[PDB]
C-alpha cells in the first residue's frame, strides 16, 4: 500500500494525494517545460517508473521522477 499525488496541471505542480490500487507500488511525476512562462506537470500511480534523461540531441525540457515514499511527489 502506498499513497501518491495523482493529478495534472499546466503550471508548477498540482496537489492531489490518492491511495494507489492493489497493483501499483510507485509514484510517477512527469514535469514538462514548454515555455519560460508556461509549464506542465503530471502525476499518477504506476507499477514501474523510469527516469527520463535527455542531454545530447533530444529535447531535455522534460524530467520524469519516481519514488516509493508516501506523498513523495508532493
UniProtKB/Swiss-Prot annotation:
Its main location: membrane. Coiled coil: none annotated. One of its GO terms (biological process) is synaptic transmission, cholinergic. The keyword Metal-binding does not apply. The keyword Membrane applies. One of its GO terms (cellular component) is synapse. A lipid is attached at residue 72 (GPI-anchor amidated cysteine). It comes from the Eukaryota. It is found in: Cell membrane; Cell projection, Dendrite; Endoplasmic reticulum. Isoform 1 is considered to be an endogenous 'prototoxin', that shares a N-terminal three-finger structure with snake alpha-neurotoxins. Acts in different tissues through interaction to nicotinic acetylcholine receptors (nAChRs). The proposed role as modulator of nAChR activity seems to be dependent on the nAChR subtype and stoichiometry, and to involve an effect on nAChR trafficking and its cell surface expression, and on single channel properties of the nAChR inserted in the plasma membrane. Modulates functional properties of nicotinic acetylcholine receptors (nAChRs) to prevent excessive excitation, and hence neurodegeneration. This is Ly-6/neurotoxin-like protein 1. It comes from Homo sapiens (Human). The chain holds residues 21 to 93 of 116 of the full protein.
Amino acid at each position: 500500500m502506498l499513497d501518491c499525488h495523482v493529478c495534472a496541471y499546466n503550471g508548477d505542480n498540482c496537489f492531489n494525494p490518492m491511495r494507489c490500487p492493489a497493483m501499483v507500488a510507485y509514484c510517477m511525476t512527469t514535469r514538462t517545460y514548454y515555455t519560460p512562462t508556461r509549464m506542465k506537470v503530471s502525476k499518477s500511480c504506476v507499477p514501474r517508473c523510469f527516469e527520463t534523461v535527455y542531454d545530447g540531441y533530444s529535447k531535455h525540457a522534460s524530467t520524469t521522477s519516481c519514488c516509493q515514499y508516501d506523498l513523495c511527489n508532493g
